Amino acid sequence: HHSPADPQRIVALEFGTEVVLEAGIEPVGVIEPVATLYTAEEFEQLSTYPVVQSASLEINMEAIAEAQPDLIIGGVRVESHDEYVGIREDLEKIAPTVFFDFDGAGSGLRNMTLELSRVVGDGERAEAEQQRFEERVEEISTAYADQLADTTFALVFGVDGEFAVVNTNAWGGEILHTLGAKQSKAQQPAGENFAAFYSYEEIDELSDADVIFYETDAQENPDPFTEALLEQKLWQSLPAVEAGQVHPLRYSAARTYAQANIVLDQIEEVLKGL
Amino acid sequence: HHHHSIPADPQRIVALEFGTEVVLEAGIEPVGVIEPVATLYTAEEFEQLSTYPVVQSASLEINMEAIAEAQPDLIIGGVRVESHDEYVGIREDLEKIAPTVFFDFDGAGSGLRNMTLELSRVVGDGERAEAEQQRFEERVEEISTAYADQLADTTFALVFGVDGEFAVVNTNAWGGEILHTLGAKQSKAQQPAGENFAAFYSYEEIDELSDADVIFYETDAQENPDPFTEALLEQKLWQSLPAVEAGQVHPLRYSAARTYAQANIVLDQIEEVLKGL
Amino acid sequence: HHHHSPADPQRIVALEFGTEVVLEAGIEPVGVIEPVATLYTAEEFEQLSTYPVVQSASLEINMEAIAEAQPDLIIGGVRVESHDEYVGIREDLEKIAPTVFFDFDGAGSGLRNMTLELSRVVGDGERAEAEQQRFEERVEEISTAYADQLADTTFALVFGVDGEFAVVNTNAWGGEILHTLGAKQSKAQQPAGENFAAFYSYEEIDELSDADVIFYETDAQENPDPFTEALLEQKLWQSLPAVEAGQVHPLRYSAARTYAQANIVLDQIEEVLKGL
Amino acid sequence: HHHSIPADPQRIVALEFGTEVVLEAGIEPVGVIEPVATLYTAEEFEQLSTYPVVQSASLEINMEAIAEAQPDLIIGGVRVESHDEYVGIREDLEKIAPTVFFDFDGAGSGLRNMTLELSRVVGDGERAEAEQQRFEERVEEISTAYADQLADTTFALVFGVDGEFAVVNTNAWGGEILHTLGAKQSKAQQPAGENFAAFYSYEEIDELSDADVIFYETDAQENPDPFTEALLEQKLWQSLPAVEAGQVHPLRYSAARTYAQANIVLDQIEEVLKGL
């Protein structure tokens, strides 16, 4: 918070993609697009751009050279800071390179990307969105204070053979918490971790929820593992389920403030219905 | 100059930004007001303000048509000095409707409550407003000498929360300036601010406030923290601060004292805490 | 001006709003508009049925039946919106007897002053004026005897309609007389603006959570219409602070047509103020 | 709803509930939901049968047919429980032409108010508003003109289905208009709770033993449907006090989709109220 100008050819490494898309910029090189992170049109568009870093984060220094950038941007997990002071000294031979660190799975992401989209000179819309967020959690937290306190929420997604319950310190779970919304006792075992994991045998764990969000991709479709969860026998017995209070939640990860505001939009729609 | 040594008695006042408090304090019912923001007002005050025609948006966009319709005899408001040229133009426009008085203010300290003193005068409520300024000055002297010892020993802090970060208010802004004016000392967590109104910190850096014997956090006019300040208060690392362990963390209403009446309530709150030390 | 500082009419036809004038004057009309029994006490209604009907409830005037009543004076009120229409009619009617129409605007004090003039025309000027001064003295008297109540207490005046209810505004009928008194009334009336009431769905009944006292309109004999009765029967209604506390009351003559009726509103608002 | 996108639409497509509105407006529609004869007069049904069908009796909307009709405006009503589902339909339909859907809660006053809205939009606002006020006046009129009979007489509104029969509750159709009116209705209502109707077998017809008068639903031309007809043949129907006593009557337009219809329900209840 507060109290190489005008770049033409930007390479966007991990967490860079969202910044440039939000900025209206076409990047000259990009990390390998995973389709779950983008609207179908954004995925189709990104697939025409040169792939410069793999989904497993190994960087092609020759691809980046070939793309001839003014500016390389990226987000870095703080625990690998040491590894990346080497990477950016190397990369700086090719162009001015800006990494930013973030810590955890909460506000660190939307703040890290706030930075990056300043650097590419989109600082105004970004800052706009940060302020919008801060005003809306203020607005929503008080307007639905009764609902938020009465209601037990849960936010889930499926993995292979197991389902997760997102914690108070990550993705949409953080945003629910900041909002003053209480969440299932299934959450508590997570501790410092971002989620607590359970077997299909343990689905009853969610029986105290009045509303359940499940994570979906940018097109409101669940991945096959979440889909496998919503198909389990025990899932049909949940008070939240048989009461018809199960909803999708797009952009759960909140990689930016625009995305975090779409999460709030979706929480509010569910709040009105109570 | 603010200390001393167009209609008299105006009937239909339109209170743009910072004019809301002026007319409230003067018991005047305006004919048009800036869109009420609930956190600036008491519960009772906010209901009352909701019965008046909105004439300006929270984002400061002015509805001239609605202002004309309210047929006012006086239009009042405060202007940030960096916008002075933009508002010479807004004044020309509005003056076709009614006599329009704007006052400028610089910064985040005593400027604000003097700009409102000026509006209070313009509005006919000069005597109460000057009384209140006289009172603020007298109490600062009274409290200063009566608690001299505590103010010398106690290191204070004033914090508020943003999304994922918190702020320490500087000595040149809001309640942090009223502490200073009084001669209270404040945590070294202030030091990065410089000329800015606050120093920002990660939840990691909460130890910086270890310094503080007492801590104030900013609330609304009804003593409630906003969610972000509440998120600060909940952190694990917060529970280790010496001021927290000692049970010396308190709400602070009207930290951003817009009027002298307001600044006097901040002094009131600072005095109760001083009595408890 | 309404405030001051055919001589002796024997056979009076009383068109719309004329009825209330002769009743108050003790005069027996020779012809009258169709009596609608919500407007009168039981007794008054019985007496008004034995008078030859001369104007329909939809305000259609029967010139033949008027002539046959042999009037020496035809009186009536006229909404000022229909002023033009009615110089035509007065022209036709004056060929039978002297015809006095009087215009009225709005839903506030307009009415009771127009009947005051009709009362003067008819020969009843003294009682009518007296009631007018009486209304004023009682508003002063009440206003200061229960200043504390009038200061604390938030009133609300409702009537029902089909599927919705109305909160009466400060500028009409019983909500005007409350305002004239200086009583304060629920925020629920704000959306009316310059209109005489604000409408709401039964889901919106908690807007009146505001109120310490609620009046509901009734007919001259203290029975609510079916639509109002509909409203008191709703579920949400029994969760209203005003309803929990037993402060819901009828109000006759809410749309006070004369100063006598306006005084009976005051009378009713006074008996409520004692109880608080 | 009470007072205190083409302006002059040429080509209207009437989805469910629009049919009554354009009929009432004098407007020929350029496409229509599948006509159901029971809802219309014989004349009305012939005319409706010449307009391009655009929606099925099961409310599957044929987007294509709608486009071939090239409408100005697409009107219709929507059950508020399907509000969600229909935000995708409107966004679809609005590719074709400006779409005005109005939500309605329940089977009672909801309907006639939701059609009042639609009647405004196609510019028949005056007549439609006129009926609304005429209804409200008549419910007051009839309620006090026959207060004795409403207090004394137990009513019931019934209709047949396949193998069973129904009693209309106080919150739906003509059962609501009876309630609104102050009429009491047979204990047969009570098993419905919040539902629109109680269903019984032919073995349970004696549950109407307490009714003094019974209305059976008919179509716009006073013929009962066959299921209703079969009800009226059952031994236990034939034994009911009200059936034996002569006091069993048809009731057209029980559904009261519009205020004009609702008023025809009233004329019919009034007619029976006279005879008592």
Side-chain angles (χ1 to χ4, degrees), chain B residues 6 19 26 43 45 53 66 72 87-88 93 121 130 143 162 164-165 178 181 223 231 250 259 274:
Chain B
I6 67 182
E45 271 169 359
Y87 266 82
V88 176
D93 205 277
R121 288 178 166 138
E130 299 182 7
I143 307 179
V162 300
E165 280 170 346
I178 295 187
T181 289
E223 211 149 86
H250 311 269
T259 67
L274 276 171

Side-chain angles (χ1 to χ4, degrees), chain B residues 184-207:
Chain B
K185 51 182 199 172
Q186 288 169 90
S187 163
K188 67 158 188 75
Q190 274 176 332
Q191 262 227 341
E195 287 289 328
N196 295 314
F197 299 149
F200 284 88
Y201 291 105
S202 77
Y203 292 157
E204 331 307 327
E205 307 161 278
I206 289 190
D207 219 5

Side-chain angles (χ1 to χ4, degrees), chain C residues 37-38 160-164 195-199 202-203 219 223-227 233, chain D residues 1-4 105 109 112-113 132 135-137 139-140 143-144 176 179-181 259:
Chain C
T38 35
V161 292
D162 182 45
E164 283 182 330
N195 299 303
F196 299 156
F199 292 94
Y202 296 144
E203 340 297 341
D219 71 12
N223 312 310
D225 69 35
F227 302 112
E233 268 159 5
Chain D
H1 300 310
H2 286 79
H3 284 5
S4 233
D105 206 35
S109 51
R112 47 184 170 278
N113 274 279
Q132 180 174 66
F135 179 78
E136 295 180 309
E137 285 162 356
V139 164
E140 222 309 316
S143 154
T144 65
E176 188 255 21
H179 182 67
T180 298
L181 206 51
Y259 275 101

Side-chain angles (χ1 to χ4, degrees), chain D residues 58-59 61-71 73-79:
Chain D
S58 54
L59 286 59
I61 292 175
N62 191 345
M63 262 176 295
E64 187 190 34
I66 295 208
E68 261 126 76
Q70 308 177 91
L73 166 77
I74 308 201
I75 77 186
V78 37
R79 312 181 162 59

Side-chain angles (χ1 to χ4, degrees), chain C residues 229-241:
Chain C
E229 179 45 46
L231 171 58
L232 312 170
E233 268 159 5
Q234 292 318 86
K235 191 188 174 53
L236 302 88
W237 186 267
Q238 277 73 352
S239 328
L240 286 176

